[PDB]
Amino acid sequence: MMSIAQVRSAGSAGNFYTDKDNYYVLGSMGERWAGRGAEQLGLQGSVDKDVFTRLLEGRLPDGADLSRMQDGSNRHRPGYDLTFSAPKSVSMMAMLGGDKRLIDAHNQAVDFAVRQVEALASTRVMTQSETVLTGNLVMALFNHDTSRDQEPQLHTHAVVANVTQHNGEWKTLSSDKVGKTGFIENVYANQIAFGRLYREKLKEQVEALGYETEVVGKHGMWEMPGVPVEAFSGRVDPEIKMAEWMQTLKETGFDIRAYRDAADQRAD
Ligand SMILES: [Mg+2]
C-alpha cells in the first residue's frame, strides 16, 4: 500500500529520512532523486542531506526561494511523504532471505508508480483560482527496513518536495480543501490505485524471478506462499533487533536457501 502523510519540517525530516537506524537491516539508504522537476534541476543520483533540507525549506538550488520566514518559523509546507510498503513475505525474503534482487524489484515498482503520481502534479493561479497540471515534482526516495510494528518492512519514503515548475517559475504545489482539485487531493483520491499500481508492478517482477503469489486481502494484497509471515505478527539497538529477527526465523524451520532454489528453477 501507499501511506500519505505531510513531512514534519526540514530539520525534522532531514535527519529522520536518513537516520541509518531506519535502515540498519538493509545497510544502505538507496536514496535517489526522482521527477521531471529534479532532473530539470540537475538533481541526479544520491541525495545531499543539505540540498534535501533546503529543498524542504523551499530553497531550490536553481536559486528560487519559496520560504516564508515569519518570526522564526517557516510558513512553507515541506512536502508530502508517499510510503510504498512491500508485503511481509517479500520484505522478509529481501532482508532476511539474502535475495537483494527483491529489493531492486521493490524500487523499480515504486518508480513505476511515482510517475503516475507525478502526472497529477498541479499548481494554482487566478484569472478566479484554477488548478493547472504541470507533470513534474521533485522527489527524494528513501528506503527503510523496520516498521512501527518492529517487523521487517521494506518500504520506500517518496518525499515530494512542495514545489512544481510552471511557466518557468517555481510555484508551490496545488492545494484546495474545497473542490478537491489539488494535487494532494487527487493523491488521496487514488491511493488504492497507486498502492495497487506499485504492488502490481512488483508481483510481476517477483514472478519473473520464479516466485509465486497468493491473494490474501482485497485490492490485491498478496503474499509469497510459504514465507513464515506470521512469525512476525502479533508483535533499543538495531543490532539486537537484527539478531532477534534472524533467530525468530531459524525457529520456523523455513528453508530460505531451498525456497530460493525452488524459484531459480521454476523460471530461470
Ligand atoms: Mg520509516
Short mmCIF file of C-alpha atoms and ligand atoms in Angstrom, two decimals:
data_model
loop_
_atom_site.label_atom_id
_atom_site.label_comp_id
_atom_site.label_asym_id
_atom_site.label_seq_id
_atom_site.Cartn_x
_atom_site.Cartn_y
_atom_site.Cartn_z
CA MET A 1 0.00 0.00 0.00
CA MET A 2 0.89 3.70 -0.19
CA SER A 3 0.51 5.75 3.03
CA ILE A 4 0.13 9.51 2.70
CA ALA A 5 1.45 11.99 5.28
CA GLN A 6 2.84 15.52 5.44
CA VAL A 7 6.52 15.98 6.25
CA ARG A 8 7.17 17.45 9.70
CA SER A 9 9.82 20.04 8.86
CA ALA A 10 13.18 20.49 7.10
CA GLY A 11 15.43 19.69 10.04
CA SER A 12 12.88 17.23 11.41
CA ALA A 13 12.63 15.37 8.09
CA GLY A 14 16.29 15.69 7.18
CA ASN A 15 17.81 13.60 9.96
CA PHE A 16 14.80 11.29 10.07
CA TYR A 17 14.69 10.23 6.41
CA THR A 18 18.38 9.36 6.71
CA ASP A 19 18.78 8.09 10.24
CA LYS A 20 20.88 4.99 9.48
CA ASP A 21 18.78 3.19 12.11
CA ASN A 22 15.68 3.18 9.96
CA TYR A 23 17.81 1.13 7.55
CA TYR A 24 20.31 -0.90 9.55
CA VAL A 25 18.99 -4.24 8.23
CA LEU A 26 19.40 -3.10 4.64
CA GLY A 27 22.70 -1.43 5.38
CA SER A 28 22.03 1.27 2.81
CA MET A 29 19.55 4.04 2.08
CA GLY A 30 19.24 3.60 -1.68
CA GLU A 31 18.28 7.26 -1.85
CA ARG A 32 17.99 8.74 -5.34
CA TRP A 33 16.11 11.75 -6.69
CA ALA A 34 13.08 11.42 -8.95
CA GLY A 35 10.79 13.56 -11.04
CA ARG A 36 11.00 15.69 -14.15
CA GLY A 37 11.41 18.56 -11.75
CA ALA A 38 14.52 17.04 -10.19
CA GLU A 39 16.26 16.30 -13.48
CA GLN A 40 15.31 19.78 -14.58
CA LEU A 41 17.35 20.98 -11.60
CA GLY A 42 20.36 18.81 -12.31
CA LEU A 43 19.48 16.75 -9.23
CA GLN A 44 20.63 13.22 -10.04
CA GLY A 45 21.70 10.22 -8.03
CA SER A 46 22.36 10.12 -4.33
CA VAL A 47 20.73 12.74 -2.13
CA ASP A 48 22.64 15.54 -0.37
CA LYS A 49 21.05 15.91 3.09
CA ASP A 50 21.60 19.66 2.87
CA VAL A 51 20.20 20.04 -0.61
CA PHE A 52 17.22 17.98 0.55
CA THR A 53 16.58 20.15 3.64
CA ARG A 54 16.96 23.42 1.81
CA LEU A 55 14.56 21.91 -0.72
CA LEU A 56 12.14 21.20 2.14
CA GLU A 57 12.67 24.73 3.41
CA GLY A 58 11.58 25.94 -0.02
CA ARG A 59 15.00 26.99 -1.31
CA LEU A 60 15.91 25.41 -4.61
CA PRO A 61 19.47 25.02 -5.95
CA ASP A 62 18.13 26.71 -9.07
CA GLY A 63 18.23 29.78 -6.86
CA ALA A 64 14.47 30.23 -6.47
CA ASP A 65 13.18 30.60 -2.91
CA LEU A 66 9.62 29.91 -1.70
CA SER A 67 10.38 30.07 2.01
CA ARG A 68 8.25 32.49 4.05
CA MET A 69 10.04 33.20 7.30
CA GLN A 70 7.70 34.64 9.88
CA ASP A 71 9.22 35.29 13.32
CA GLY A 72 11.49 32.23 13.41
CA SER A 73 9.26 29.65 11.73
CA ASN A 74 8.73 28.96 8.04
CA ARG A 75 5.19 29.02 6.63
CA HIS A 76 6.19 26.92 3.64
CA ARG A 77 4.96 23.34 3.72
CA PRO A 78 7.91 20.96 3.12
CA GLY A 79 6.08 18.37 1.07
CA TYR A 80 4.30 15.03 1.18
CA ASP A 81 5.60 11.62 2.15
CA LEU A 82 4.39 8.74 0.00
CA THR A 83 5.44 5.48 1.64
CA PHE A 84 5.25 2.37 -0.53
CA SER A 85 5.38 -0.84 1.52
CA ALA A 86 6.29 -4.37 0.49
CA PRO A 87 4.30 -7.46 1.53
CA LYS A 88 5.64 -9.10 4.71
CA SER A 89 6.70 -12.15 2.68
CA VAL A 90 8.88 -10.04 0.41
CA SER A 91 10.29 -7.61 2.99
CA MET A 92 11.35 -10.76 4.82
CA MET A 93 12.78 -12.54 1.77
CA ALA A 94 14.55 -9.34 0.69
CA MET A 95 16.29 -8.61 4.03
CA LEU A 96 16.33 -11.96 5.84
CA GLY A 97 16.44 -14.28 2.84
CA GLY A 98 19.52 -12.70 1.31
CA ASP A 99 17.84 -12.05 -2.05
CA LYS A 100 18.80 -8.47 -2.92
CA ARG A 101 17.01 -8.84 -6.27
CA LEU A 102 13.70 -8.48 -4.45
CA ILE A 103 14.86 -5.10 -3.08
CA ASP A 104 15.73 -3.87 -6.55
CA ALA A 105 12.30 -5.09 -7.63
CA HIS A 106 10.73 -3.09 -4.84
CA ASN A 107 12.50 0.03 -6.08
CA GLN A 108 11.60 -0.39 -9.69
CA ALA A 109 7.97 -0.82 -8.73
CA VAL A 110 7.93 2.42 -6.74
CA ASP A 111 9.44 4.28 -9.64
CA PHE A 112 6.78 2.92 -11.98
CA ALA A 113 4.16 4.26 -9.57
CA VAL A 114 5.74 7.58 -8.57
CA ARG A 115 5.49 8.71 -12.19
CA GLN A 116 1.75 8.30 -12.39
CA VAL A 117 1.78 10.21 -9.13
CA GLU A 118 3.91 12.90 -10.73
CA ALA A 119 1.36 13.32 -13.58
CA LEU A 120 -1.16 14.72 -11.13
CA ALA A 121 1.30 17.47 -10.16
CA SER A 122 -0.50 20.81 -10.28
CA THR A 123 -0.41 24.44 -9.13
CA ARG A 124 -2.81 27.34 -8.54
CA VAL A 125 -3.34 30.68 -10.30
CA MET A 126 -6.31 33.01 -10.64
CA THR A 127 -7.80 34.91 -13.58
CA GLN A 128 -10.79 33.08 -10.10
CA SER A 129 -8.26 30.50 -8.85
CA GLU A 130 -7.89 27.39 -11.02
CA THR A 131 -5.74 24.23 -10.89
CA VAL A 132 -3.47 23.67 -13.87
CA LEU A 133 -1.44 20.50 -14.26
CA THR A 134 2.34 20.52 -14.57
CA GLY A 135 3.58 16.99 -14.80
CA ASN A 136 6.58 17.45 -12.57
CA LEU A 137 7.60 17.05 -8.96
CA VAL A 138 10.97 16.97 -7.24
CA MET A 139 11.50 13.93 -5.08
CA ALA A 140 13.79 12.07 -2.77
CA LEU A 141 13.04 8.37 -2.25
CA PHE A 142 14.48 6.69 0.80
CA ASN A 143 14.28 3.06 1.83
CA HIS A 144 13.70 1.91 5.39
CA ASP A 145 13.58 -1.63 6.79
CA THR A 146 11.64 -1.82 10.07
CA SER A 147 8.10 -0.66 10.92
CA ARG A 148 6.22 0.68 13.96
CA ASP A 149 5.43 -3.00 14.36
CA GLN A 150 9.17 -3.63 14.80
CA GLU A 151 8.86 -6.01 11.85
CA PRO A 152 10.78 -6.18 8.57
CA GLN A 153 9.09 -3.74 6.24
CA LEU A 154 10.92 -2.98 3.04
CA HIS A 155 9.30 0.37 2.37
CA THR A 156 10.32 3.47 0.48
CA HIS A 157 9.59 7.04 1.50
CA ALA A 158 8.72 9.02 -1.60
CA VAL A 159 9.22 12.56 -0.35
CA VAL A 160 7.60 15.00 -2.78
CA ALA A 161 9.07 18.50 -2.39
CA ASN A 162 6.28 21.08 -2.19
CA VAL A 163 7.31 22.81 -5.42
CA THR A 164 6.43 22.48 -9.12
CA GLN A 165 7.87 24.24 -12.15
CA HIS A 166 5.17 26.10 -14.07
CA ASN A 167 5.88 28.55 -16.90
CA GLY A 168 9.50 28.76 -15.80
CA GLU A 169 8.70 29.90 -12.27
CA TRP A 170 8.77 27.54 -9.28
CA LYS A 171 5.39 27.81 -7.59
CA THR A 172 4.16 25.72 -4.67
CA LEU A 173 2.02 22.62 -5.19
CA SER A 174 -1.72 22.74 -5.74
CA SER A 175 -3.72 22.84 -2.52
CA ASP A 176 -7.51 23.02 -2.34
CA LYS A 177 -9.67 21.75 0.52
CA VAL A 178 -12.94 22.63 -1.27
CA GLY A 179 -13.12 21.40 -4.87
CA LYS A 180 -10.55 18.68 -4.12
CA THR A 181 -8.75 19.79 -7.31
CA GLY A 182 -5.42 19.95 -5.54
CA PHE A 183 -2.55 17.65 -6.39
CA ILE A 184 -2.68 16.20 -2.91
CA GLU A 185 -6.46 15.88 -3.10
CA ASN A 186 -6.10 13.75 -6.22
CA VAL A 187 -3.41 11.75 -4.48
CA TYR A 188 -5.84 10.96 -1.70
CA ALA A 189 -8.40 10.02 -4.35
CA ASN A 190 -6.20 7.37 -5.93
CA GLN A 191 -4.33 5.91 -3.01
CA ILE A 192 -5.69 2.43 -3.74
CA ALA A 193 -4.85 2.51 -7.48
CA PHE A 194 -1.36 3.87 -6.88
CA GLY A 195 -0.88 1.46 -3.98
CA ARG A 196 -2.16 -1.28 -6.26
CA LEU A 197 -0.11 0.04 -9.19
CA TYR A 198 3.00 -0.27 -7.06
CA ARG A 199 2.07 -3.85 -5.95
CA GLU A 200 1.05 -4.81 -9.49
CA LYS A 201 4.49 -3.99 -10.90
CA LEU A 202 6.10 -5.92 -8.03
CA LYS A 203 4.02 -9.11 -8.37
CA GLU A 204 5.24 -9.12 -11.97
CA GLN A 205 8.93 -8.69 -11.24
CA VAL A 206 8.86 -11.23 -8.45
CA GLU A 207 7.02 -13.83 -10.52
CA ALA A 208 9.57 -13.32 -13.27
CA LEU A 209 12.09 -14.27 -10.58
CA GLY A 210 10.33 -17.62 -10.26
CA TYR A 211 8.36 -16.79 -7.09
CA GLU A 212 4.62 -17.48 -6.82
CA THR A 213 1.96 -15.20 -5.27
CA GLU A 214 -1.39 -15.57 -3.48
CA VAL A 215 -4.24 -13.22 -2.74
CA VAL A 216 -4.55 -12.51 1.00
CA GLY A 217 -6.51 -9.24 1.10
CA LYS A 218 -8.73 -7.09 -1.11
CA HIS A 219 -7.46 -4.70 -3.82
CA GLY A 220 -4.58 -7.11 -4.47
CA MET A 221 -2.88 -7.66 -1.11
CA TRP A 222 -0.89 -10.84 -1.81
CA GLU A 223 1.98 -12.61 -0.07
CA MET A 224 4.64 -15.13 -1.08
CA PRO A 225 3.28 -18.66 -0.45
CA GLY A 226 5.21 -20.34 2.31
CA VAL A 227 7.03 -17.41 3.88
CA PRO A 228 6.63 -17.61 7.70
CA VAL A 229 4.90 -14.22 7.58
CA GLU A 230 3.03 -14.95 10.80
CA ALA A 231 6.29 -15.42 12.74
CA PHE A 232 6.46 -11.61 12.53
CA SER A 233 2.92 -10.63 13.56
CA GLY A 234 1.29 -10.31 16.99
CA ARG A 235 4.48 -8.42 17.87
CA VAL A 236 16.96 -0.13 21.69
CA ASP A 237 19.66 -1.12 19.22
CA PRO A 238 19.34 -2.15 15.57
CA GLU A 239 21.82 -4.98 16.02
CA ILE A 240 19.81 -6.51 18.84
CA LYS A 241 16.74 -6.37 16.57
CA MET A 242 18.56 -7.94 13.69
CA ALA A 243 19.73 -10.96 15.68
CA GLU A 244 16.24 -11.33 17.16
CA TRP A 245 14.79 -11.35 13.64
CA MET A 246 17.42 -13.85 12.46
CA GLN A 247 16.69 -16.02 15.46
CA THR A 248 12.89 -15.83 15.17
CA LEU A 249 13.17 -17.08 11.59
CA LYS A 250 15.52 -20.02 12.29
CA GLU A 251 12.87 -21.11 14.75
CA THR A 252 10.32 -21.69 12.00
CA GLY A 253 12.17 -24.33 10.06
CA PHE A 254 11.66 -22.48 6.79
CA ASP A 255 14.38 -23.37 4.31
CA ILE A 256 15.33 -19.98 2.94
CA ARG A 257 18.02 -21.46 0.72
CA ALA A 258 15.61 -24.09 -0.66
CA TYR A 259 12.67 -21.72 -1.22
CA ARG A 260 15.13 -19.70 -3.25
CA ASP A 261 16.38 -22.52 -5.44
CA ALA A 262 12.76 -23.53 -5.64
CA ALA A 263 12.22 -20.34 -7.65
CA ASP A 264 15.52 -20.16 -9.50
CA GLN A 265 14.42 -23.41 -11.17
CA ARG A 266 10.75 -22.54 -11.71
CA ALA A 267 11.79 -19.72 -14.06
CA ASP A 268 15.44 -19.17 -14.99
MG MG B 1 10.44 4.84 8.43
#
